[PDB]
Design a protein around this nucleic acid. Structure first.
Lengths: 71, 71, 76, 70, 71
DNA sequence: TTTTTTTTTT
């Protein structure tokens, strides 16, 4: 929701069509994002404090889910 | 594509001879660039908003593919 | 050496003295510059169009190699 | 100190208290200038051929080290 | 403080409302001048030895800060 | 006054 680059924050959410976006970027997710996966992602990146644009954060989430679920 | 430096944009494509160029720059690609790889690259850099010449964008794409496909 | 300040051009070479020069500037290169590293460097800077003296181009190349080879130490 | 505005030259050195001067100009250097850093700075500016006063060259060195070490 | 043109000297200061003046001249400073920025400016111009009026020195300071901070 | 190339939780 902020414009420009921002640090991750507790109530951030990816777009409603995140699963479709992820597929367009080459990450096939076969299950929806869970509240726990999102919370874990956010806690990690909120602590890290690095700043990204919303679309870039969604790409990081897509990649993180792909790796997390592969294991 | 535009002349001079430009921001990345949705229907950007690398050159038809991108694979040859990438090889000349030390990146041996065995497969053509996928629709998804290109879409992901573009979304990331479009958000970033930095401006480069066409040839410089192609170099970034080559390097990104090298890393992306290595894993 | 090529004289004056010039834009990067396709046939540019850092010369035979490069590795010694790089070392004097604090960049220890163990392997010579590859054809591909050089071609990539040249294509980037030729597009950029900035103009430098030969020694200043060599410094940029040294720095670029140091960073490029740092994920490893050596040539990709 | 070298007098007047001059082009950079191979044997140039900053002052013995360069670190202190740099700090006064807002550049906190943790480690002294290395032989290699100085040589690189001199080669760049010697090629460029621009002329500056000694203090102005020291300011350029301070700024270059700040960036280089970042 | 001297009237007319003068060479830059160690104890020189710009006006208390320098930030506002700078803005009126088209230089938007986000932070006050620091003691280190001022010392650096003075050392540079003192060596140069050129002479300017007080207002002209302030303009040079504004421009120098704009460039210095843009990096 | 104006030196500084380089996309990443696992």
């Amino acid at each position: 929701v902020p414009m420009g680059k921002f640090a991750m924050y507790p109530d951030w959410q990816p777009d409603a069509d995140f699963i479709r976006l992820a597929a367009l970027w080459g990450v096939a997710l076969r299950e929806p994002v869970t509240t726990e996966e999102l919370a874990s992602f956010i806690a990690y990146w909120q602590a890290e404090g690095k700043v990204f644009h919303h679309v870039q954060w969604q790409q990081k989430l897509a990649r993180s889910l792909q790796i997390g679920r592969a294991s």
